[PDB]
Amino acid sequence: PARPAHPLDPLSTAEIKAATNTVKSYFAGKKISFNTVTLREPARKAYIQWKEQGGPLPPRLAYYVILEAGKPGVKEGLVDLASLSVIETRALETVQPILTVEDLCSTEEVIRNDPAVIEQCVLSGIPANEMHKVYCDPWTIGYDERWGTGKRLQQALVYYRSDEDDSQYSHPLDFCPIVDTEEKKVIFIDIPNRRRKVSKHKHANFYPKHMIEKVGAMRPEAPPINVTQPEGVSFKMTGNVMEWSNFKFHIGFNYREGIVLSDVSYNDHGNVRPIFHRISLSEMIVPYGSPEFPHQRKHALDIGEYGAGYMTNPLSLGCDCKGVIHYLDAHFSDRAGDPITVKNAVCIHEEDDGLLFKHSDFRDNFATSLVTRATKLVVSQIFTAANYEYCLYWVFMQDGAIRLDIRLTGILNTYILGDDEEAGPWGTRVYPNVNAHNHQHLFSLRIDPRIDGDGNSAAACDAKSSPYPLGSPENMYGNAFYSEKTTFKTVKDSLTNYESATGRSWDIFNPNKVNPYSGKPPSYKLVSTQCPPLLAKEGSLVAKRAPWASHSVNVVPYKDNRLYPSGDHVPQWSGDGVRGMREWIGDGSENIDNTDILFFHTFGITHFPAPEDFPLMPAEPITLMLRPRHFFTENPGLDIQPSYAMTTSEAKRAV
Amino acid sequence: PARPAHPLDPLSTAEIKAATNTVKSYFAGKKISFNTVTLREPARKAYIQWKEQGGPLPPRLAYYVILEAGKPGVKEGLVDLASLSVIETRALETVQPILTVEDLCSTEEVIRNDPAVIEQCVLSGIPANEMHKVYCDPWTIGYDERWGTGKRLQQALVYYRSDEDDSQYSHPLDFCPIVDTEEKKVIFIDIPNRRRKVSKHKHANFYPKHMIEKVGAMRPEAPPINVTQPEGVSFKMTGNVMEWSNFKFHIGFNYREGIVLSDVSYNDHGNVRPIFHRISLSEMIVPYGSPEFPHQRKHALDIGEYGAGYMTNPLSLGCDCKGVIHYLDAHFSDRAGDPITVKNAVCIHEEDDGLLFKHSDFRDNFATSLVTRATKLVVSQIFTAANYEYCLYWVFMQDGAIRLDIRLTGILNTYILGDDEEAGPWGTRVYPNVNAHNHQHLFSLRIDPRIDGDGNSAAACDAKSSPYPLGSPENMYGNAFYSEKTTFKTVKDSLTNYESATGRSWDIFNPNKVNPYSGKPPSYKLVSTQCPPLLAKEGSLVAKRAPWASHSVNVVPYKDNRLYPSGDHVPQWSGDGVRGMREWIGDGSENIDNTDILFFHTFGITHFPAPEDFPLMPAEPITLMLRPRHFFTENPGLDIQPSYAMTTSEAKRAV
Numbered sequence A, B: 001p002a003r004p005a006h007p008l009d010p011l012s013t014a015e016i017k018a019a020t021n022t023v024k025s026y027f028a029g030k031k032i033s034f035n036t037v038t039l040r041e042p043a044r045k046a047y048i049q050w051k052e053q054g055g056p057l058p059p060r061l062a063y064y065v066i067l068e069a070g071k072p073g074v075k076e077g078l079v080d081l082a083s084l085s086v087i088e089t090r091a092l093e094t095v096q097p098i099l100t101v102e103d104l105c106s107t108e109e110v111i112r113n114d115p116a117v118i119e120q121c122v123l124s125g126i127p128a129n130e131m132h133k134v135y136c137d138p139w140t141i142g143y144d145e146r147w148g149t150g151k152r153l154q155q156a157l158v159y160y161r162s163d164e165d166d167s168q169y170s171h172p173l174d175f176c177p178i179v180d181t182e183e184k185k186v187i188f189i190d191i192p193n194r195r196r197k198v199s200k201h202k203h204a205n206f207y208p209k210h211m212i213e214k215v216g217a218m219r220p221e222a223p224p225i226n227v228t229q230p231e232g233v234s235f236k237m238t239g240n241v242m243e244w245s246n247f248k249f250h251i252g253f254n255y256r257e258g259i260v261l262s263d264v265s266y267n268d269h270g271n272v273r274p275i276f277h278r279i280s281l282s283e284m285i286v287p288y289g290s291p292e293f294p295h296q297r298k299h300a301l302d303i304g305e306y307g308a309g310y311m312t313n314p315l316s317l318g319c320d321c322k323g324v325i326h327y328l329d330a331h332f333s334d335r336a337g338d339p340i341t342v343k344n345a346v347c348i349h350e351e352d353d354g355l356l357f358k359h360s361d362f363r364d365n366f367a368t369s370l371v372t373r374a375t376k377l378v379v380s381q382i383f384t385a386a387n388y389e390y391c392l393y394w395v396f397m398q399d400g401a402i403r404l405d406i407r408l409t410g411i412l413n414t415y416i417l418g419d420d421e422e423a424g425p426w427g428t429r430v431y432p433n434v435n436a437h438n439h440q441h442l443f444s445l446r447i448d449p450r451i452d453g454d455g456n457s458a459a460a461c462d463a464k465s466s467p468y469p470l471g472s473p474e475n476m477y478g479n480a481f482y483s484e485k486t487t488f489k490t491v492k493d494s495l496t497n498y499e500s501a502t503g504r505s506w507d508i509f510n511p512n513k514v515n516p517y518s519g520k521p522p523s524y525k526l527v528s529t530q531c532p533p534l535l536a537k538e539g540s541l542v543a544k545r546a547p548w549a550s551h552s553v554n555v556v557p558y559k560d561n562r563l564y565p566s567g568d569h570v571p572q573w574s575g576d577g578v579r580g581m582r583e584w585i586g587d588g589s590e591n592i593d594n595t596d597i598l599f600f601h602t603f604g605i606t607h608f609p610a611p612e613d614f615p616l617m618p619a620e621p622i623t624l625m626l627r628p629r630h631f632f633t634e635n636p637g638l639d640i641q642p643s644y645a646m647t648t649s650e651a652k653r654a655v
């Protein structure tokens, strides 16, 4: 195909096709199907040389994952787009790949047409002639020791709608069909010892017509609040490259991680200084807390099992982004090797963010005063994973800080509850016969830093009282306290958790440089507090398949292609084996001090459902920030025009 | 005077005057001065009876604090405005009151004219004829065991401006004058053993003219982002009473706490349910961490030693509040007993707050979808405490949650640093010869709840893995986990801290009611995470004067007039004695389960200064929230008109 403007640009629909064509040719005569066709980003070293040392343009490569009918597992490899050839390929017969919307969408019809499933519905109080009202969310089996990776399986969380417009979640069924993805047939049905027939209650619906019926009527439309940017926006985009408030970076996107920000830097009044080479969400795990069979299989690693890209919502229509928006489209490949597009997958825009800073002198009753307002750049995406939606917002700020805001909304995963059955301690009865199980939403932020250049380190920062006691010459009044910096020398040293006791934060810094004022190295500080401990016991399915989740921080040596902490092919992996984070950690002895490192941060929330979350849940916020500390020698936004400003002398002139 | 519309309305300029006149007459022939004239809110019981049981209008009372020339301490009491008579009065000879801007504003001139002070300036390298270039921030002495409360004292943090438009903070002097407030004269000067003369560097300024000089020029004005509400706002204010999104409450204000929200309720579709009887910030402490003399004296309790009302900035001018704003004014009394007004002390308005909730069905490629945007109500104030500004935002949201957002900005407190002196572990060298000491900003949120009525309790909620181990019949895969609820029975039980290990949150609930769905009592959950431990040792000045700061939560029995946790008259109290929180706690044995309680939450941040905070610091955020959990039986904003909505059937018609 034709090369892209930038080496990190996602593959075009043409490159995708050229790739699939190349692969189909390689496997001529073989009945292959496409699971993934995505960009294989260039080597970190190659890229940087090209970008800053006049190095050559890296080869435009494509990474693929295919399935061959009658063959176990998958086959993966690389295609060198320029020469249209498969330059690397291999078969992984004992692994299962990410579930595309294509392998997922057929499942509902298959269980609907399965005699066994039909009998269970009838048993459950649903006539065999009404199977059209039976729905199901297709999930990976997650992991079921009965089959391992010997069969590509899915589990169907079954629900019932008395009307197509209903929200099915108030009416879950009690059984769980296991489906062979490839064979397209139910191979087993998990049935509870205690049977619970369909709820006979009205569905808990949320559309206006439903509401008008539920409560008298809808609230009157409210006076509008219109946002307008008459002279345009202040950011400038050159292809996928963004430019705003001295920040400059490339906005990428892929089937798995979704948004990928790269080559982030800041123009420090002429001096363009690197901050991060790449940053994104590399994995997740949403572990449920009911120990009852088969609920252990509910611990989805959405990024690696479905893909934040594959599940993304086209943003335009819903009014998700308010204001002067700038969109980006996403391109994948379908099962056939043909490009597929999802319009407005990413939405870019700037908004007001209140005050940036302010100060007035009390001496002239605040006449002397200066106010500068703040505006933030937001790069967003919103994806749907069956019942829930994850709204992601990468936020850049005018003080040099970068923040990740997430908002969880959508619908609670629900299971059936008997008339006289207690939601017990593992879940909440949010509606008659509905049980919403406890669960955690955990994310793994992957940061590849380049804080003010190459050669970085990480450290834990704990606030501490002076060791000297009250009344001592050294701490006479006992108010002394400082910040204890523990820089990680070895991988093992970094495996740390957030501690409230010390208001812990983590620094990613450049030990090769010093701030001329403070004397400290330049750095970006991770200020994250929503760091839940992994509640699943050690050695549990959850803990094993998500090795990265047991620690708030995991810092390992950089290596090309160390992206996914739970492994490259996550579905149905048992958790046994040295891959992903477990492999990168090794024996924990590798050096991570003043070298090229990778920082994986686990953050998230623990959800204990309340009726307020049903039938549709109000957004729940999660945030984390990376602030520059000792990076600059003074506040960097002081040359931004203030909103208001009166000098002391001027206040005098005004009389 | 004339009665106000609402019993909770602050005193009018008329009531203030009628009050001072009444006091002056009572102390006829005595040379008295006014320190405080404010509303003495009605008893909780009387107020409620009047509000909901047709009880009588409570008497309009005014609380005063006066000083009498030649008398030690102060005198306080109540005036029954209706009958214009002092109905209660008493003298506190061993106490010192809050510092008004009047007792604070004379200090700079007195040290300027003091011979001792002048000599120190000369010594420090500033000619005696340039004392007009010497400035000082007048602070409470805090507490100095050399004088106790025997004299009303202030300590002057001395600075130097080479030009009146300079920001003095880059040029602190090394000594600290002690001034007798009443006598208006320097009684002592703390001089360090190691002398450090005035810095000879340029001042670190931040006005545009300064910046143009510093860096080549200012950034070009940015394209505007205009916010317009053509058809008005959606909230309705009847006097101080606000009504918005089913919320209804009274917006009060006073010299000390600043904004005070009262009688908060929510209209649950016709059922008006109480939530909070009163909520506000009752005290603060900003303890510094340098153990060196006299820096122990830096631990300001701003609310009780200066007043969030007294220090508040008139909001209009600065462009603090963007959009269609509705202001409120504040009225206090000056030294003479004459009313004083600070216009636009509070600013009210509603803004966009992104998505409220959203959900799309993957079955018809998200055609089936519903999106409802969120708007929040903001009642704000911004006060200046010498060098820093505290921006306060009480936020009400459409899911029934209430949030308190704080943003810290302004300027770092700085002390002089020797050319070859290390800011050591206690502070940071943010600029040549400038040392910014470590410190914490802590706040005491006082909540008087009425969760869905009377008879409340509080509890600590901790996330826990099941006690049964991996492989046991009860937790076969080890994923089981729940929330441990520990409801406080006795005051002692409540003294708790936020714990990251359990992702702890606290519940204020009504044990007399039950959610018909979940079976739990109605409640509002405190989701707060920026809860720094008090770093000052026990028995320290800080820990003693701020009894409430040692715990994230303190729950005590309600009693009329239990407002200020550090006592009613905070300046110069040693911290020895049963008053404030220490008094309310008692032997910690009083019941707090299902009764009228008071919840004081300690939250804030620990500030380790970095050059980025100098010479003017970018806002630092702090937040805390109170969400309804089990209060409602379903999402309460479902009847808000969605921004977009397509039914499954409708998506079919659209073909």
Ligand SMILES: [Cu+2]
Pocket (backbone or CB within 6 Å): A408, A439, A441, A607
């Ligand atoms: Cu959840």
Ligand SMILES: [Cu+2]
Pocket (backbone or CB within 6 Å): B408, B439, B441, B607
């Ligand atoms: Cu601070």
